Amino acid sequence: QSAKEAIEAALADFVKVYNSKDAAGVASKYMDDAAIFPLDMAPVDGRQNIQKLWQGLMDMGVSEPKFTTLNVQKSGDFAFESGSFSLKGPLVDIAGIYVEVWRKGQDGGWKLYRTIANLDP
């Protein structure tokens, strides 16, 4: 298993947990001091607030998440990722681009540390 495949597997699980409507499970995939920065929108800091974000999307009926990993570079205990995303809202397409950093755990699992994303118009 390569680094890209490892990240792709991590995101595949992310998708499954989201689709099970388990916002806490989604939030566990982040470091506690992780942060999401949606450009031209309010930053989201810490796992607790990140859980609220994903719970909010669930509550709004947002579905069918897809996260396409384009490029991955492993650097020390970090993995640097470029990708795209697409979701569906009540059906409305919600899509865009992101870059993000994962941190490898002692257990060998990857967790999200930093995400920067932008929504297409």
Ligand X SMILES: C=C1CC[C@H](O)C/C1=C/C=C1\CCC[C@]2(C)[C@@H]([C@H](C)CCCC(C)(C)O)CC[C@@H]12
Adjacent-strand bridge partners of 38: 117
The residue among 36 and 72 lying less far from ligand X, judged by its C-beta, is 36
Interaction of residue 115 with ligand X, rule CB under 6 A: yes
Residues 38-67 that bind ligand X (CB under 6 A): 38, 41, 57, 60, 62, 67
Measure the CA dihedral 74/76/78/84, to 10°. Answer: -20
The answer to whether residue 30 forms part of the interface with ligand X (CB under 6 A) is no
How far apart, in whole angstroms, are the C-alpha atoms of residue 19 and residue 13? 10
Q: Where are the alpha helices (DSSP H) in 1-121?
A: 3-19, 23-27, 47-59
With CB under 6 A as the contact rule, the residue among 6, 17, 27, 98 that binds ligand X is 98
The DSSP symbol for 43 reads -
**9 touching ligand X, by CB under 6 A:** no
In the three-class reduction of DSSP (H, G, I as helix; E, B as strand; rest coil), residue 91 is classed as coil
Q: Which is nearer to ligand X, 51 or 115 (CB)?
A: 115
Total number of residues that touch ligand X (CB under 6 A): 16
Residues near ligand X (CB under 6 A) are 14, 36, 38, 41, 57, 60, 62, 67, 85, 87, 89, 94, 98, 100, 115, 117
